[PDB]
Design a protein around this ligand. Structure first.
Ligand SMILES: Cc1cc2nc3c(=O)[nH]c(=O)nc-3n(C[C@H](O)[C@H](O)[C@H](O)COP(=O)(O)OP(=O)(O)OC[C@H]3O[C@@H](n4cnc5c(N)ncnc54)[C@H](O)[C@@H]3O)c2cc1C
Ligand SMILES: O=C(O)C1(C(=O)O)CCC1
Length: 499
């Protein structure tokens, strides 16, 4: 194998204490940079919470709830009398009433500022059955998934883009659908991507790979049963499709990004990337995109490979750095194979340290990589902004975020300094499709929003202080090493696969 390639295979499942200890010093921000990252992260997160004055509103609740000292339900019943007294139009009537004589409709809305259904459930199922089950699951899937979808068709989504593109946001469009099971399914996904490239290209109109929209694709949509697909069949069947779409994105000069999926396909996607990058028809073109997952132990080794690849094939690569979306499934997979170890980290803070270390690796080679830092975590953003150094220029890097999750945070980021933003561009990942293609994406978003470890989850918990929410991962890791006795131990509730 190649020297860069061999090192990747060597790190597939390396001990977690080993991996974390190596990344730790590459991820440590120097004390001056670290404090500036702290301030900016604190500001971003504070404005995200006290947006509708959610923080200070809870303060006046706790204050009057102290002085008067009654139930939380008692406080809500007080607001209801207060609101109905404020609805008395004449003051002299209201006050004389307060002293002479002395409805709960909006107590619901007031409660938010402060088991019998289980009977209905067991009851409803018996008479209704697997039809009721399959309908309700579909129903909640559409209802929860609306917020994550840009449009049902490529044309409806291109239209939805202008509002934010006029403010300096970019877009990457994703035609939903993945893990093709039949040659037909893969063929159809091939069609909907070509149709999308045309639409997004006519829309782009020469704006170019950096400043115009682009497209994101999944190899697993392009080949039947990609899960266990063999090497020779993938190159004969998938690669010509990957080539074709990429040629097409070049003619329109739009970025085309290869999404990263489950970790046992990292090898094969590198093989496809390696061949794509030496097509003569793509020589001198820099529009090829590739996601790397910082939660994998071999991400730093992939970066060394990609850096060498960009040199050998004489192009600048567009590399989306992400943490990763399949962590639950990666762990359950590794636990069932009883394999040597895990390919991903087992403590969330380890992934953050991985991400910070990989970001520095990417920022050091602007001639060979255009970094695209995908994240919704205020501290992560703040740290990359500091790590990228003074004297920003547009093509140095960009941020990325998911439709439905990133806009509140990046609206402090993309925009003019005069209007109080950071003047850094953000590309919004924009899914496109109907109900029939939303399931796997939605589930991954439910796993993301619902985890106690996720930034977007903890920012909502106004009982968690901002200083803990934006705390520094290197320091977190070193605080554990000192309490536990050694740097980088696996998560306690997650033993090694064979145990
Ligand atoms: C625009 C965009 C494109 C993306 N494309 C891809 C892609 O092609 N492939 C892909 O896999 N991901 C991709 N992601 C990432 C994924 O979808 C999540 O959005 C991302 O991981 C969340 O990171 P965050 O820094 O915003 O949140 P943070 O909450 O600070 O990080 C959360 C992440 O930490 C990781 N994590 C959670 N628990 C643990 C644990 N116990 N041990 C170790 N690690 C843990 C998971 O990666 C989790 O998602 C993309 C994200 C964005 C924004
Ligand atoms: O991580 C992934 O593969 C993404 C998904 O959830 O489909 C693409 C953007 C996140």
């Amino acid at each position: 194998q190649s020297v860069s390639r061999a090192a990747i295979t060597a790190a597939y499942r390396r001990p977690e204490t080993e991996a974390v200890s190596m990344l730790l010093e590459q991820a440590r921000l120097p004390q001056p940079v670290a404090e500036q990252a702290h301030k900016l992260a604190y500001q971003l997160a504070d404005k995200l919470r006290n947006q509708k004055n959610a923080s200070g509103r809870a303060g006046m609740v706790q204050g009057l709830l102290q002085e008067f000292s009654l139930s939380s339900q008692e406080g809500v019943a007080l607001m209801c009398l207060a609101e109905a007294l404020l609805r008395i139009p004449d003051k002299a009537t209201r006050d004389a009433l307060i002293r002479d004589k002395i409805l709960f409709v909006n107590a619901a809305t007031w409660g938010l500022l402060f088991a019998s259904l289980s009977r209905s459930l067991n009851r409803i199922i018996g008479k209704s059955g697997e039809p009721l089950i399959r309908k309700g699951v579909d129903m909640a899937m559409r209802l929860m998934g609306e917020q994550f979808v840009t449009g049902e068709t490529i044309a409806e989504a291109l239209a939805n883009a202008r509002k934010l593109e006029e403010k300096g946001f970019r877009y990457s469009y994703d035609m939903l659908g993945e893990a093709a099971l039949t040659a037909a399914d893969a063929q159809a996904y091939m069609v909907s991507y070509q149709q999308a490239i045309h639409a997004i290209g006519k829309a782009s109109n020469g704006r170019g790979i950096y400043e115009g929209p682009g497209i994101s694709i999944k190899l697993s949509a392009l080949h039947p049963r990609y899960s266990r697909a063999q090497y020779d069949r993938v190159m004969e069947e998938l690669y010509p499709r990957l080539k074709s779409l990429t040629l097409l994105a070049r003619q329109y000069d739009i970025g085309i990004n290869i999404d990263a999926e489950e970790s046992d396909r990292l090898e094969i996607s590198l093989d496809l990337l390696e061949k794509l990058c030496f097509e003569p028809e793509l020589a001198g073109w820099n529009g090829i995109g590739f996601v790397i997952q910082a939660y994998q132990k071999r991400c730093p080794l992939v970066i060394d490979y990609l850096i060498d690849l960009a040199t050998r094939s004489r192009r600048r690569l567009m590399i989306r750095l992400v943490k990763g979306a399949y962590w639950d499934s990666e762990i359950k997979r590794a636990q069932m194979d009883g394999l040597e170890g895990y390919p991903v980290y087992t403590r969330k803070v380890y992934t953050d340290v991985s991400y910070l270390a990989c970001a520095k690796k990417l920022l050091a080679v602007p001639n060979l990589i255009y970094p695209q830092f995908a994240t919704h975590n205020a501290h992560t953003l703040a740290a990359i902004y500091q790590l990228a150094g003074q004297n920003y220029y547009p093509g140095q890097y960009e941020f990325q975020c998911l439709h439905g999750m990133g806009e509140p945070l990046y609206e402090q980021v993309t925009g003019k300094v005069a209007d109080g933003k950071l003047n850094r561009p953000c590309r919004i990942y924009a899914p496109v499709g109907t109900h029939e293609t939303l399931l796997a994406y939605l589930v991954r978003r439910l796993l993301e929003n619902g985890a106690n470890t996720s930034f977007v989850n903890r920012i909502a918990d106004t009982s968690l202080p901002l200083d803990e929410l934006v705390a520094d991962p290197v320091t977190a890791v070193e605080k554990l090493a000192q309490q536990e006795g050694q740097t980088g131990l696996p998560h306690p509730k997650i033993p090694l696969p064979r145990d």
